[PDB]
Design a protein around this ligand. Sequence first.
Ligand SMILES: O=c1[nH]c(NC[C@H](O)[C@H](O)[C@H](O)CO)c([N+](=O)[O-])c(=O)[nH]1
Ligand SMILES: O=c1[nH]c(NC[C@H](O)[C@H](O)[C@H](O)CO)c([N+](=O)[O-])c(=O)[nH]1
Ligand SMILES: O=c1[nH]c(NC[C@H](O)[C@H](O)[C@H](O)CO)c([N+](=O)[O-])c(=O)[nH]1
Ligand SMILES: O=c1[nH]c(NC[C@H](O)[C@H](O)[C@H](O)CO)c([N+](=O)[O-])c(=O)[nH]1
Ligand SMILES: O=c1[nH]c(NC[C@H](O)[C@H](O)[C@H](O)CO)c([N+](=O)[O-])c(=O)[nH]1
Ligand SMILES: O=c1[nH]c(NC[C@H](O)[C@H](O)[C@H](O)CO)c([N+](=O)[O-])c(=O)[nH]1
Lengths: 200, 205, 200
Amino acid sequence: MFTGIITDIGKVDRVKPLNEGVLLRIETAYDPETIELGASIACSGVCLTVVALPEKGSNARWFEVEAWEEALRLTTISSWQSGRKINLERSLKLGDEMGGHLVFGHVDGQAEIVERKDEGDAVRFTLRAPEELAPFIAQKGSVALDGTSLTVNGVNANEFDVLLIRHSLEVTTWGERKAGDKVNIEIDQLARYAARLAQY
Amino acid sequence: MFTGIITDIGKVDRVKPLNEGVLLRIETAYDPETIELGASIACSGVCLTVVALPEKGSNARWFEVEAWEEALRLTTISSWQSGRKINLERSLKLGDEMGGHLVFGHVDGQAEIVERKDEGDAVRFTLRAPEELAPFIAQKGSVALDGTSLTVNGVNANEFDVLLIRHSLEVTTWGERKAGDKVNIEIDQLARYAARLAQYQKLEH
Amino acid sequence: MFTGIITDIGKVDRVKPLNEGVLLRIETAYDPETIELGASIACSGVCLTVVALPEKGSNARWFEVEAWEEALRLTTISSWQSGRKINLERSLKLGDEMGGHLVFGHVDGQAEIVERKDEGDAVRFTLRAPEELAPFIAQKGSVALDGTSLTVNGVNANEFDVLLIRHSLEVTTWGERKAGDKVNIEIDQLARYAARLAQY
Ligand SMILES: O=c1[nH]c(NC[C@H](O)[C@H](O)[C@H](O)CO)c([N+](=O)[O-])c(=O)[nH]1
Ligand SMILES: O=c1[nH]c(NC[C@H](O)[C@H](O)[C@H](O)CO)c([N+](=O)[O-])c(=O)[nH]1
Ligand SMILES: O=c1[nH]c(NC[C@H](O)[C@H](O)[C@H](O)CO)c([N+](=O)[O-])c(=O)[nH]1
Ligand SMILES: O=c1[nH]c(NC[C@H](O)[C@H](O)[C@H](O)CO)c([N+](=O)[O-])c(=O)[nH]1
Ligand SMILES: O=c1[nH]c(NC[C@H](O)[C@H](O)[C@H](O)CO)c([N+](=O)[O-])c(=O)[nH]1
Ligand SMILES: O=c1[nH]c(NC[C@H](O)[C@H](O)[C@H](O)CO)c([N+](=O)[O-])c(=O)[nH]1
């Protein structure tokens, strides 16, 4: 589990093909001495488990993860190539506060940025989400876009807007986002359960 | 408390029947110096208390647990024989990373594997959950199956699917699971809070 | 921080009025050499700081704490008189085992015991929760009642059930608890998250 508070901008070093999957090497500012093997890291909102770390003595700062069929089909990982900057977040530690938005790294699909407009030192992004996600939006709660916890402001069916503040643009990949870009979308976990309960 | 991140594959050494209970001796890779009597260890998702350990200074690596009436009835434990491989997880300590979700080790019942499909080096498992548990299983939600924190992908009535990654298949008992097998199911406690608010709001109006 | 695993039954020796507060002197079985000035101790679920200790060379086994407006308003502290037995728990350190659940020692309010019923070695307590907390008390959920980590056995409107085992009744103030008694209530992190989302 995560909080959607991005702590690093990672970089895709290499993409290696696996049997119906990809091996991703991600460059990070995180100390590999603080990353245990098997740790869960949210990579642009995708929960992935660390499978390899640099050799003892090596000055390299990377971690390796494996993205399989569900992650490839639904997430932006399908388009990831060497040089791609990605949002990073470490798992929530027992004792730390949960905050206003829990993020599990279970992305529903890809939302598309249709408009980017500057509003002072902040940037308003207008997005379109897959049709099936529309009833979860309009509820105007919090959403995880590329692993970033964001408040849903205006809504028109499957179209919605988010306001990215100066700090968020600086410390996340949102500073380089533009119209046409695909982002990972994760609907609020409690809202998922509430909607599933409503079916019965 | 647990997170559903399996850290060892234990092996059932001894199965001893007691008065409405069973004494289980589990061989483990865990350091005996890290385990004290009264410790809680999730055994294939079942929270069990350590009742016996090897002698002070011994190199033997095992721990004993007792599964009573509730555990024997709701869980897969009733079928556990000597040689059975089980998923193991230590209780969360202050400051430990919660890699999965909040897992309590309180198994709600048993889910049956209806299909095992290869997805390259990953494996898709289709499961049938008890009817009562179905409203708590949501698409892209969390579930603890044999104590393993997993993302629920598709859901159709009381049937749902999960994708077991290569890493999980290698470090858990999921690598040997097949169609027809019964697994321990613990629905996400977060779903109970959604059900509670909906129950309170219904009683209100 | 705390886990809800009570380690001592303290006794209130003195209740002294302060300017906009209350000073409490608590007798404890804790080793006096292990209690340092400024240490956090959960007193019937209320996180309070040690303000005074016995002087150099004294054999006395007490500690002093100060309760302010928030604690006096929300907790049972306002009703505490000399001779009152209270649950005690020392603060956790990074890496400590957590036998109960995550307890911050920040009580949300007071729950009232409406019924006490024997069930073999165990005792079933029925409690009335404040209306603001009631929609966030769910079955199988963890709750801190008088600082004791307990599982919610059943729910019904504003009422909920907890089952107190023989050991818990023996080592905590729950053994002397009766119908009509007010207890401190602290909802867990999941309940707090659900309450925060409903508030938003
Ligand atoms: O393919 C993977 N999926 C994993 N999880 C599920 C994944 O997050 C979802 O399939 C994705 O978010 C799309 O829903 C992984 N871990 O959890 O560690 C992992 O390492 N690899
Ligand atoms: O720019 C924003 N940051 C927000 N949150 C903080 C953001 O998640 C972090 O700054 C970022 O993840 C980097 O840590 C928002 N909400 O939480 O709703 C929001 O609407 N906009
Ligand atoms: O039978 C037992 N049940 C226990 N707990 C409840 C058990 O987890 C559930 O009965 C089971 O998960 C089914 O719901 C134990 N501990 O908690 O330690 C234990 O040692 N033995
Ligand atoms: O195989 C998977 N592992 C996952 N997580 C990690 C898994 O719990 C551990 O690898 C395992 O418990 C061993 O530590 C998943 N998600 O978290 O979503 C998932 O969907 N599939
Ligand atoms: O009145 C006090 N409140 C304190 N904390 C907050 C207190 O726990 C809450 O007000 C109470 O639990 C009600 O929410 C103290 N410390 O933390 O040390 C203290 O010493 N005194
Ligand atoms: O009597 C109980 N003790 C429980 N836990 C142990 C209790 O917190 C301690 O015995 C006590 O705090 C003294 O250390 C319970 N749960 O944890 O759920 C419970 O429901 N009932």
